[PDB]
C-alpha cells in the first residue's frame, strides 16, 4: 500500500503531537521511552449512528479498531509482550478520548 495505515472507511483522528504518558507501572515507561515502535500520535475510529456515546462506549471500541489495524495481541502475533500492549491501550484510549470528542463535534 502507498500509505495507508488501515483507514479505508475509518474516519482517522488528527497526529494528536509529540505524545506523552506517566503510566501506572515503570515497564512500559521504560518500552515509551525505548521509543522505536512508540506508533504515530494518531488513532482510526469508526463513526457511529447512535451519536449520543461517552468516553467508555465509544473509546473502547476506538482503541480496539486502532489495535487491529497496528496488529497488536500477544494471543495472535505472539511477538508481543504484555508491557507493550499495555503501553497501547492506555495511549490509544487517551488518544481515542481526545479524537471521541470530535465525534461528537463532526457529530
Given at each position: 500500500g502507498s500509505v495507508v495505515g488501515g483507514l479505508g472507511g475509518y474516519a482517522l483522528?488528527?497526529?494528536?503531537?509529540?505524545?506523552r504518558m506517566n503510566f501506572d507501572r515503570p515497564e512500559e515507561r521504560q518500552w515509551w521511552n525505548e521509543n522505536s515502535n512508540r506508533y504515530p500520535n494518531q488513532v482510526y475510529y469508526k463513526e457511529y449512528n447512535d451519536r449520543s456515546v461517552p468516553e467508555g462506549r465509544?473509546?473502547?471500541?476506538?482503541?480496539?479498531?486502532?489495535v487491529t489495524?497496528?496488529?497488536?495481541?500477544?494471543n495472535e502475533n505472539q511477538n508481543v509482550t504484555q508491557v507493550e500492549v499495555r503501553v497501547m491501550k492506555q495511549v490509544i484510549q487517551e488518544m481515542?478520548?481526545?479524537?471521541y470528542q470530535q465525534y461528537?463535534?463532526?457529530s
Amino acid at each position: 500500500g502507498s500509505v495507508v495505515g488501515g483507514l479505508g472507511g475509518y474516519a482517522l483522528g488528527s497526529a494528536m503531537s509529540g505524545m506523552r504518558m506517566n503510566f501506572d507501572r515503570p515497564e512500559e515507561r521504560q518500552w515509551w521511552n525505548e521509543n522505536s515502535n512508540r506508533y504515530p500520535n494518531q488513532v482510526y475510529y469508526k463513526e457511529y449512528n447512535d451519536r449520543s456515546v461517552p468516553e467508555g462506549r465509544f473509546v473502547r471500541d476506538c482503541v480496539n479498531i486502532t489495535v487491529t489495524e497496528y496488529k497488536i495481541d500477544p494471543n495472535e502475533n505472539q511477538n508481543v509482550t504484555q508491557v507493550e500492549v499495555r503501553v497501547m491501550k492506555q495511549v490509544i484510549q487517551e488518544m481515542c478520548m481526545q479524537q471521541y470528542q470530535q465525534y461528537q463535534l463532526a457529530s
